[PDB]
Write a protein that binds this ligand. Structure first.
Ligand SMILES: CC(C)=CCC/C(C)=C/CO
Ligand SMILES: CC(C)=CCC/C(C)=C/CO
Ligand SMILES: CC(C)=CCC/C(C)=C/CO
Ligand SMILES: C/C=C(\C)CCC=C(C)C
Ligand SMILES: C/C=C(\C)CCC=C(C)C
Lengths: 366, 366, 365, 366, 365
């Protein structure tokens, strides 16, 4: 009912978008920024131009994540607003297309790992690409990428089946649970589009991460796992855990509902007499948003995914006002974005319908 | 016949140039900037030198529109002032020559769309080039570019005939009505120069854009259309609409006269006790000249095409004085151009005799 | 014989140099700048090094004119001062050599016109180079460039013979009278060195520019002509006219004497109680030195060519004092040069013996 | 047991780490800086990415020593904390891997000395790489690099046998005793891993450096030796001596014990009432840390190797506090590092278990 | 007089180095700058690495002179201090090796003169290289470069034999007497090392420059000579003359002793109560160190060569203090070097034992 002094819309309105079958005016102004201006908007063209990311100063290694999080948000826009589904499909088509430019995956070759970014490992890239394939087809019904979707899904499936641990590495001896959660979710999307049972591998993965990679008492994942050396980095990560639990909640709700409360105790800091919240990146500090600086942003998505309106309001009251949003000519801009992936992650959280709902998204109007 | 500060000539003077068969002194001073100084004036050489555009900081993707709009203005100078027809012919020759330099069309290749900018799609470029081919021949009677004109017109004609929708896309699945209107307008020019009836396609296109791409109540076109996904971007665009209605008015005057009064109500903001006007780029905002920033400029051209002297005076009183024109050594310069393509569009609007009149331009000598 | 603030030597002194057989001390200090410091002075080396022009921030397209105007000044230096004739020859050799470096002519290729700078058109370049070939041979007696001189003179002669208009274009459909006057002057120099009569084409050319390209009432040429489209840019150009009249005065003095007074009335503004002058680039304006900014500089050369000491003094009182000349360690420098080609054009005007006098220059016997 | 101002932990705590089987909290925070943040931490990936060194402005020629000194510290972390041994192995794996990127060794080729950095000479590079091969196998027990280890050991051994002087040169005619001490130590590591007696060549080398390259009264080595001309640069070097004695102490302790007290008299300046010390780089000056600026840092390592807790405390009270250390989000940072290789050498000194102990390191098990 | 603010050691100390058989502490600190710090010191490595000159902002065309002048000083360090002779030998080895990198000679190819920097002309480069070959062999006794020394010495000797004038040019028609003086001096070095008599051509060269290239009244050489055009640049050059006289003094002492007094009258300006001196680069000015800015520095070398302790002290009192020397960690640095080649030339002048003394240098046997 109320509007904090730096907010564009209430938490109640964002949560009510799907019920009203319409996005809020500030979410529409974000779509305007994404689509409106010729040449320099990010979703103007399927070509290999990245002026939009250059204007925002996005580091090259992060463009792939920017594109993915836009894509995940567009999928929920499609489910929220039938009137906007066609735009979302058009944007997803451009997203898939840009995701394959060498400007996006080229770091894999620059680092010396090879010329093929999908053949082996590099799950940090092809996991998002594979999920984007499926989200696009669920939204649009187009089979444009169906051959490529089935190819990358088979590659992913075979790689899981061959590893003694459950899941896939990004680089040799570098295993990240959050990147695996994206890959497993893409098997569910494929199963939903086809008749397959690629998701059958999800059980062993949840068992594997639950006994080996998670601190059950604090409800937090460790930074990363290294199978060849049997090592686990001894720090628990807030941004890691929030992302993983958000995507897991769409495959196995009970799993994430068990750790979410313990997770909030470990990392979440409520302040300003309960009106604001910020998130510790790791244990043993009171500093907020260390490391990659995304603990608060990803926790905002997790609260949305978990339906935690109180924490969503508290995190947004910390994130948005200091970023100084403004709407000029019906288009959204942030003057002091507080982190990398800022407008992408706030966009995603405001519209996110939950990864489960995207799995059950209805077919298009044919 | 009053003259406010920063205006160089009255609106009555501009509208009376053709009856007097003489351009106004500030239009002559624009022609001096275009032609006078060795090396750095835009029309000094047919070679691939672009110092003039580098001096103005024209983004590379905009040079093709800068060249084209110069060309369209030069065609009207040819019709206005017989004494200048040879000079305008010479400039048109150089414009066509520069339009073919890689520095002008090269973005098509950088984005990954191919090595031939005219073979498929890319109507945003080859449409203007095709029109310039024809306008050059109407002014001069020279057949220098006649073969290329017949080749590109044939490509345009075949591409229209092959599409299930009426028109041609710029990029795969990106349809822009303003870019199609240039291509359709060029078919009429070819018909005037030869006996052809390539213009027969205009009926289907006017029916198509009227049923799918226009908001009949507000008289405004949507930003863009995307055939593959059947999507239409949900924003109406002033610069899209002003440009399209201006060009359609030379092919079907009744069409543009139908929506013009509603277009003005949707986009045009009169202020300063009726002496000035500025234009919204889209609905739902009071900010003027958002998006690419050309709404007021393109509405100035439309007012010229439509014979709306009052609106023309209001827009020029907003656009020109703040740009600080000065005439030094009989050459026109603006100290603070308010947008991209500024001196090009003000030049064009000041001389524009109407796209219908360019089509019905009398033949040259022999 | 008074010296205004900021002037280095009197107009009477510049005009008296040939009679005294010695250049003024400030012309000597300009040659010092041209020849003195290793590596960075413009006439240090025959190699393709251009440090001197980079230090001056000369636009690349303008380098060719810098070299050519230095050469024209060095040719008069040879005629003025026998003790300096050998040095002028050495400098002319360096000038010709640098003139052929790709850094000087390469714009012809960047602009997409081809890989050969002399084969066809481009008279703006090969015309100056052809004149420099001949002036070099006149100064030194050397035949080092005689072959290249005859080849390019034959190239020019043939291009004239083939055109329905009189002269040669720079780019297709770009005809510049000032660039043609350099080319025609080069035919007289070639004829003077040998016995030929290549200069016979000058009659048709002067007939052509007089009937089509000059406004006889105002004594001023239009900016340019464009044969293919039959167009003439409708602005009269002061720097075009001053340059063209100066060189024509060496081939047909009566021609330039007929228009010079009308040129002064059209473009020249005397001010400061008759002590200064500046030149409007075109009609219909009060601005001085618009366009390329060379109207006053070339009119200074024209006044020298015409023997107009009064106008020369007025123009130099406008051009030099604001540039703040100084002589440091016997070398000339300008703190605020007012235009492109500044030290080159003042150099040329101070020593210029007349293009006709250069044609009749005596051998180094 | 008292804590000097600006210090993070006591000298007693650093020295007590191995007995307590735990690193101090600031050493753990240094490991976090090395491992925590995606992409930009130094040991995130085995790829040829060097963002961490670009952020620190490390000169290209110094990257190889940065990696090596990190490696040596991680080896001691393996001995100190069994709980951290697997992570240390993982980091060592990444270290040798990064060590072989052209960005690290490429100066050998840019300087014109050849295309193969291990073929001949260049002991300043392959000496460290070879030691890293063996330390990785000592820590992890992996034979991953065993083949390359034996290849480079034979190269080194054969090069020693062929020279009339004892050792190997860096660039042609550039002999550096410190770079040789690294290679000889790698021969002992190979001997420990296998049965070999490659270390037998160490006797002739110790005799050679003792009669030709050291000033015996001042306990100091000369800058360098140049076999072709028989020349010895007539300056004694503190950083050269500190490094050489430290590594020699692991092969022949008696040698380093003999010169250490003379080295301290020659170069070390105690000040601030015995609470601090800094090191002169050469004789005949009172300036500290001239030349490469590493005399004090390397002497900190030597005091650690020699067990000199007093000098260690005095040097650390001089180096660390002014560098303004802080711990943010459980990660260590220095606001004003005082030299090259700053956090690398302080890290090594704080954990260093002694080069002899690294040789005698037990296998991983229990 | 004591030690003025900015002087590191007295002139008496520099002149006494050879008698004490030991360099001064500031000369040792210069060698430390040359040898101490890994990677960035100029003589760290024989490879084609030039960080040291990039840090000093040495223009590329001057690196070859920086290396040569370092080498000449290292030759004297070898002769002054036997304890440092092995070091000087090693540095000379590095000097020769770096002298052959394309970064040092590449200007010849960039300017368009060819791909071989020693084949023809370019005496400005191969002259210094040839002297360094020989100086290296005298200091060390090594034949490492002997073949190359014999080949370049034969190239130089043949080119002298073919020219109608005495000497070799740098570029076609660019003759510099100071660059010829390096080349002839290298012939004497070859004669001392072997039995040859290549130096016999020195006589014709001293006759030629004495009659054509020097103003005997002012004791000064003109800037340059141009055989093809018979030209001589009409300015006398202090830096040119000081250098030539210093090197000629080692081959024919009487020649330099005759012109030295007049050179001082022409160029040297004493001031500050006899405690300082600065040098005019050319006649007709009071500005010091015009042109390339090296007149005072080269005159410091000449005073050393001539044994003129008073002028040496006066020049050093002008050159060093303003450059703000300091010794940090036993290494010498100048905060405001006053010219190109600053620490190189002050280094050389402080140690220079005389070119004749280097010619008669004893072996290390
Ligand atoms: C800018 C200067 C000194 C001359 C212009 C000459 C010119 C542009 C001729 C046409 O090609
Ligand atoms: C930037 C300007 C003057 C117009 C935009 C034209 C455009 C990009 C149409 C779609 O292809
Ligand atoms: C500058 C640093 C950290 C070490 C010096 C090592 C070296 C240059 C050895 C000889 O090649
Ligand atoms: C291995 C995991 C990754 C590379 C994810 C990095 C995450 C962000 C937000 C840059
Ligand atoms: C031709 C002679 C030369 C190029 C020598 C130049 C001398 C200095 C000190 C730069």
């Amino acid at each position: 009912a109320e509007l904090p002094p730096g907010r564009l819309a209430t938490t109640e309105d964002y949560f009510a978008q799907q019920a009203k079958q319409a996005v809020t005016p500030d979410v529409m102004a974000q779509l305007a920024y994404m689509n409106y201006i010729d040449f320099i908007s990010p979703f103007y063209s399927r070509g290999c131009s990245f002026e939009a990311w250059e204007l925002k100063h996005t580091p090259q290694r992060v463009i792939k994540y920017s594109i993915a999080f836009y894509a995940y948000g567009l999928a929920s826009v499609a489910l929220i607003d039938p009137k906007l589904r066609a735009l979302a499909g058009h944007d997803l088509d451009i997203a898939v297309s840009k995701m394959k430019c060498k400007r996006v995956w080229g770091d894999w070759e620059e680092d010396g790992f090879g010329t093929d970014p999908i053949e082996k490992e590099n799950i940090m890239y092809k996991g998002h690409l594979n999920l984007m394939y499926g989200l696009y087809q669920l939204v649009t019904g187009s089979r444009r990428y169906e051959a490529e979707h089935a190819h990358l899904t088979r590659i992913i499936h075979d790689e899981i089946a061959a590893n003694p641990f459950a899941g896939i590495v990004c680089e040799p001896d570098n295993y990240f649970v959050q990147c695996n959660s994206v890959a497993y979710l893409s098997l569910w999307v494929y199963d939903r589009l086809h008749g397959t049972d690629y998701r059958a591998a999800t059980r062993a993965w949840l068992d594997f991460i639950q006994k080996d990679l998670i601190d059950p008492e604090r409800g937090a994942f460790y930074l990363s796992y290294h199978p060849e050396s049997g090592a686990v980095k001894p720090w628990i990560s807030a941004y890691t855990t929030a992302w993983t639990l958000a995507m897991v909640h769409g495959m196995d709700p009970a799993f994430s509902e068990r750790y979410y409360p313990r997770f909030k105790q470990t990392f979440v800091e409520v302040y300003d007499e309960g009106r604001k919240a910020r998130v510790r990146e790791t244990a043993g500090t009171d500093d907020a948003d260390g490391g990659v600086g995304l603990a608060s942003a990803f926790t905002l998505l997790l609260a949305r995914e978990m339906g935690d309106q109180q924490l969503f309001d508290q995190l947004l009251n910390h994130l948005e006002p200091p970023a100084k949003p403004s709407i000029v000519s019906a288009s959204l801009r942030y003057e002091h974005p507080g982190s990398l992936l800022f407008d992408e992650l706030l966009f995603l959280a405001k519209v996110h319908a939950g990864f489960g709902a995207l799995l059950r998204m209805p077919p298009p109007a044919a």
